[model samples]
Target: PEWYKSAVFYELSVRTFQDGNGDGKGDFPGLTSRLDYLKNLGVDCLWLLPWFPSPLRDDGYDVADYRGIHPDLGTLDDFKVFLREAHARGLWVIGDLVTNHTSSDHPWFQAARRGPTLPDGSPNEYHDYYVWSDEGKEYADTAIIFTDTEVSNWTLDEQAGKYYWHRFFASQPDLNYDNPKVVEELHGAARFWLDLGLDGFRVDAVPYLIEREGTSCENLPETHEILKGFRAMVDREYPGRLLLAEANQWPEEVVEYFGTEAEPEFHMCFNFPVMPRLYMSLKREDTSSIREIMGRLPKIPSFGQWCIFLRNHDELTLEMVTDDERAFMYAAYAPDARMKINVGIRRRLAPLLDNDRRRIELLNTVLLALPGSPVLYYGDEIGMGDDLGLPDRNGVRTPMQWNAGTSGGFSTAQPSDCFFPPIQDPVYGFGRVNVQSQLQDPSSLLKWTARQLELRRAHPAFAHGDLTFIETGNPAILAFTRQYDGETLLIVSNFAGNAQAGLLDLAPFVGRAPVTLSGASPLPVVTGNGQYPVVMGKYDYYWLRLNS
Candidate 1:
C-alpha cells in the first residue's frame, strides 16, 4: 500500500510539544524522547509545524531560513537524529515548508533590502528574491488574509526603498515565485531535508504562492504550474516523498493542487470546508452542511488524497463560510468576542463543544471516518482546551499539558520565561486535561482515540477505500459505508442531543452479519431487501463491520 493513504497524520509544535534542555521550549531531543508516546498513540506520520528560524510574530509561519534550523529547536544534526528515531519506530516525519513568504530577518530578505549585492559587487540571488514595488498599492485587487493584523498586502521596506508584498503579515515578506531563482532555492531546501531522511513537506500558504494582477491573487494558474514543477522534481528525485498542500480554498478550488492523473501536483490538500461543517451539522442537529459539502467535493487524481482535520494551529478559519453561516457559527461557538479571530473562531475543539466528551468523540470519529486520512491536532486526543484570554492565536498554541502540576509538565524553565503558559482554568487546565493522567485511565479520550486510530489502520476502507454516504432517512443520523477489496465497514453516527433511529437500505450486503466495533456487541443480521435498522444514543457512533 502507499504509505500515506492509510496514514494517521499528526501536526505538532516543536516549541510546545516538549522541553529537552530545560529552556522552556520544545527541541528535537525532547520530541525524540516522546517517540514512544506518539508511536504508541498510533500516529503513522508526524507533520512538525515550522521549525525554521523566525522573529515569531507569525508563530513560525515567518521563516527566516529555509535550510537552517532554529537554534532554539536544535541543529540540523539534531533533526537528523529525530528523523532517524522516528523512522526506526515506523513513523514518517513531514517537514513544514513556508513556501509563500519568509521572515524579514532572513538573510536573503536582508540582502534584498540592501539592494542585492555582496561587498565584492557580485550579483546576489536575493536581487529578485521577494515581490517588491515602488508603491504598496500594486496588488490592491488582492484580498487580505490576516485582516485583523495586516493593513495592506504591501509593506514599505525603508532600507530597500520599496514596498514588499505579503499575504499574511507585513513582517513575512512574500517570496517572488515569478523569479526562477526563488523556486530553485526552495527546491534545494526540499532536497536538503529529503536527503536527511525526512519524508516530505506540508507546503504552507500554497494558494498565494504566485500572485497576479486583475485577480484575487490566489490559486493562480502560475501557482499550480510551480507546484506541478515541484511535483515533477519530487517524482524524479524522491519517488516515495509526499507534498501536502496547505491551500485554504474550498474543495473545488483545492483539487487543482492535485494536478491530474498523469502529472500530480500535491499528494494531498487540507479539507478546510468539512471541518466547520462538522460543527455546523452537529449544532443544527442535521447533516445538511456535511451532505452539501461532501456531495459537491471534487474528484482528484487516483494518486492524490485529502487531509481532513478538526483543529490545527491557526484559528478555526471561517473564510469559506457564508456571512449568515458565519453569524450562526459565531453565535453558536464564539459568542465571546475574544474567542473570534479574522473570519473565524479561535477556540479549540473541547471548549467549542463545551467540554462535552461525547460530542468531541463524535466529531473526531467523523474526521477519521471520512474519505481522507485524518490529520489530528497535537492535544485534541486528550481533550485540551484553549485560553481565549491569551493574546491572538497564542491561546490555541499554548504548551501541551502533560501532567497535573502547575507547569503543565511542558517545561522546567522559570514560569516567566516559558514560551507561553499552559491552560490553567479548573476545567481545562493542566490538572484536569493532561496526557500523563489520561494514560492511566482506560476510558480516557486518549485511550479511545488511540483505539479508534488502530481501528482505522486495520480497516483499509477508512483511508484507502471508497466512501458512499448511505441514505439513513434521518437527518440527525449520519451513515456511510467504506468499501474496498472484500471489506465493507459501515459508520453510523448520531449528531443530535436526543436518541435517533436510522433506516438504511443495505441491499448490497443483506446477508452479512453486523458486529458493533466500539463494544464488540453482536447485532442482528441485515433483513431481506437490505433493510438495516440502527438506533443510536445522543452523540453516539458505531463502526459496524459486515462479516469479513
Candidate 2:
C-alpha cells in the first residue's frame, strides 16, 4: 500500500527534541524515549532534520558527511535502536538528504579542493566530484539566493586556485551531477541508510541539482532525470519506502518532480505556495487567495501526494507570493524588522497568529481537512513560541517544551549549555504553555488537536477522498466536500474574525444529514430545492459527516 498518501507527518529537529546524555543537545536515545508521546499524538511518520555530521553551518543543511551520524546526536548503533523503537510503535522515519551541495569540510570536497592527483601520484577520484571552474564566469543566468551574505553563486578557493558553484553559502559547494561518480556515491549513501532500516528521505534543494548554460539553472530538464534515477533506485531496491522532494517552486512547475504515472519520481512534494496563502487568506478574512492557488495547482500522478504544513524548520516562505502579497504579509505578520528574513518571516505558527487560540484551531482544522497529508511542525501541537533574537531561522528551532521546569524538561543540562534556549517570553513561555500543562486541561489546543487526529483517522475520506469546493458566495466562508468509497464529509470554515454566514447548495445529496464529526450533533437536512444555510462564529470550522 502507498502508506504515505494517508499518513500524518511530524517534522522535528534532532538537536531540539531531547537530551539523553545530558550533553546539552538532543540525540537518538532521547528521541526514542519520546516516541510514545508522538505515537499518542497520532503522527504516522517523523521527518527528521539533517542528522548527518556537519559543521553547524546552515543549521545542518551543509552536510559534512553522507554516511556518518552526527557525534553529538549519537552513533549508528544508537540510530538503529531509535529506528527499531519507532517501528515498534508503527512510526516511520525519514531523514534529510541534501542532494544539491556538501559542506567544505566534507571529505569529498576536501579532496576535490586539493586537486586532481593524490600525494602518492595516483589520480584523486574526487577531483570532479563538484562543479569547478578556473574563471567561474559560467551560469551567469543563475540568480544568487543568499543575497544577504553571498554576493555570487561562485566562490573561490585559494588551495584549488579556482572557483566552485554554490547555490547557497560559499561553504556549501554544489555537486557535479554531470559526473556519474557523484551520482553513484549518493546512491550508495541512500542504500547505506536504507540497509540500516531508515524508512525514506526528503531530498533537499532538488531543483538545482543539474545546471545548464543560458538558463536560470533551476528546474532544468536534466534535474528530473537525476531525480527519476534516484526514484528508480528506491523502487527497484527498497519497495514501499518514500522519497519527498523539497522543490520550492510554484505548483505548476513542482508537479514535474512527480515525473509520470508509470515512473513516479517523488512520492510527495512540499506544496510551497499554498502555505503562505493559508495565512494570507486568514488575515484577509477571505478564501480567494487559497482558492486561487488551489485552482492553479495542476493534477499530479495518482501515486504522488503533497506534504502540507503551516510552518517548518525554515522561515515562512514568501517567494511564491506576488510582490503586493509579500508586502501585505510583511506588514501583517511581521511588523518588526527582526521578524523578517530572506523573503519570509522567522516566527512560528503561534507567534504569527499572536497566540489566538481560535485562529490556531481554525487553521489546523482546515489543514487536516485539506486534500493532502498534513505535516505538523514540532512544538506546534502545544502552540510553542519563537525566539526572534536568534540568528537565521533558529528562532523557530528551539527545544521542545515538555514541562514548565528548567530547560522545559527537554534536557538535564544547564540552560546556558543548551544548543538553543527554549522560549522564555512572559506570555508564551514554557512555564505557561508547556505540553504538561496542556495535557491537564481538557480544552487545551494540544488535547483538541489529538481529538481531531483521531476523528480524521476514523474517516478515510479525509485522506483519500476527492475534494470539491462549494460555491459559498460569501468570500469570508470556505466550504468543501470530500467523498471516498461510501463515505462523504463536508467541511465549512470561517476565515473572518467576525460571525459569517454562507449558503451551500447540496441539491446533489438531498435528504442527507450533516452530523458534526466532533460531537455527532445533527444539523438541518439537505433539501433539493433550497440552499443549505450555514452560520459560523468567529474563527470557527465544522467537519461534518454526511449520512443518508
Candidate 3:
C-alpha cells in the first residue's frame, strides 16, 4: 500500500501507443511488445487511459461496459497477457475507471432510457440506474462544464420522455450512485479486474458522483462516504493496490479525497493547481506564484501522496485558476485560437515552451523534486510536439513517435489509415524527434530524462521527504531542500531567459559539503554564514546532495 508513495507513473493510451497487426489502432499485444522500452524508461507504474468498451465519443471516457474490454483493443485474455508481462518487468499497471458516468450506449443506460417495463411487461432492473427528471431544471446552481457546446447539464432523452443528468458531454449520462445495485455493480467490476491481477484504477471525474440541490454539485458529503466505502472494500479485498483520484479542484478541497486520518479514500490525487502555476511561474520568470501555492496547500496523510505532472492526456486545465490568471496563460502559451479548448490550452509540453530543450529539462527537474510521485506523459521524454488542427484535445493525444517511418514506426499501416496521424511539424516531426534516434544519441533529451529518473529512484528523499523552500534573494531563481530519514538534498533552478546567480541560506547545514546528484562532483562546503553562493545558466537546474 505504501509503495505508491515512492512510485513514478507513466500515462499512455492503448489506442495511440502502437499497432501490432497493422490494424491502425493500438491493442494489448502491441503494448505488451513495448514493455521492455517502458521498463528501460525506469517508471515504476503505468496508468492506461480507459480501455473498456466504448463508442469513442468522448475518447473512451464514455465507458460502455465496466467489465468488458473494447473489441478493437483486444479481449480479456489479451489484457491478462499484458498484465502478466508488465508485472514480470517490475511495473504496476492501473486502468482508468469512469465511475461518475457511462456511455449512453451502455446496456444499463439503454435499458434505463427505455424506462420502467421490458418487452414482456415486467419491471426493468435498470429503471433507476440513472438520474432522471421531468423538467430538468433542478440543479441550476451547478455551472456548465462544456460552455462552448453544452447548453445545460440536463439532456432530454426522447425515448424515455424525460431528461437525464449529465455533468459532461450529453452522450455520457451520470449514474445514480444512490441506487444500491449501481454501487454493487461498480464494486463487482473492481473485484473482477483485481482478480485478474490488475494493480488498481485511476477513478475518473470523481467529484460529480453524488449531486444535490442548493449546491454547486461538487465534493458533497455523500460522495466522500461513497468513496470511503470503496476504499474499505479495496483494503479488505486487495491490499497493496492503489486508488488514484482524478479530481481537478483546489488542493484544500481535494484533500477530502484522502479522507480522515483513520479512513483514507484515495492513495493519490492529481495536484491540479500546481500544474498551471508551474507554467505561470516559468512564463513570468518569477517563483512567487509557485511559492504561494505551495505555502497554502494543506497537508495530506503520509500514505496519500500527490500525483504531479507537467502535462497529461487532457488539456492543461485552467478551471482551478482565476479569470485574470487564465487570460495570462492564454496570452503567454496559446497564441493561436485553435489551441484553446473547454477551459484550457490544448498543446503538448514541447510546443508550449516553443520546443526549447533547456526549458523542458528545467521544468522536469522541478517536477521530479516536488513532494509527490511525478507522472510523465508519453512521448514527452522524446520532446514530441502536438497537432493543433486535430479536434478538441486530440492534438495532445497523438500517437507515440517511435521512429521516422510510416506512422512514425508506430504501425505498419498506411499513414492515412493509422488511428491518429503522427505529428509532422518540420521542427518536432517524427524524423527529427523519436525514440529510436534519441536512444542512440547520448546527448538526447530522452537519455537525460532517463538519467534523471535513475537519480530520483536512488534517493527516497525526493519522493517522501519533508520539503522547505529556501530563501533566495533573486526572483528568477527558486531553491528548496528535502529531508528524510537522515538524508537531505538541495534543489535549485533558474527560471530566467538569461544567466542568473543567487545567495541561498545554508546556515542550518553549516558544516556539510555539497555534491552534484548526477556526477557526484563535490563543491565548496558550508562555512561561516556568509550564505552559500550558486550560479546557473539560462533554464538551468541542479540537484545537490548535502553530506555531513
TM-score of candidate 2 on Cα atoms, chains taken together: 0.98
Give the alpha carbon lDDT tens digit for every residue of 389-485 in model 1: 6788988988888888647888887545678877778998888889999999989999999998988877788887788888888999988888899
Cα deviation of 306, candidate 3, in Å: 1.1
Of the two candidates 1 and 2, the one with more favorable lDDT, higher being better, is 2
lDDT of 3 at 432: 93
| Tens digits of per-residue lDDT for model 3, 1-548 | 38788888999999999888899999999999999998888888999999999998889999999898998788899999999999998999998888999999999999999987888889988979999999998989998887777999999999999999999999999999999888888999899898999888999998999989999899999988999989999999999899999999987888889887798899899998789988998899998889888887888886789999999998889999989999999999889887888898899999999989999999999999999999999999999999887887898888899999888988998777888888777998898989999999999999999999999999999999989998888988999999998899999999998998899988998889989997899999899993988888999898999998
Please provide the root mean square deviation of candidate 1 (C-alpha atoms, Å). 1.8
Write out the backbone clash pairs for model 1: none
- Give the alpha-carbon lDDT of every model: 0.87, 0.90, 0.91
Give the C-alpha miss distance for residue 74 in model 2, angstroms. 1.1
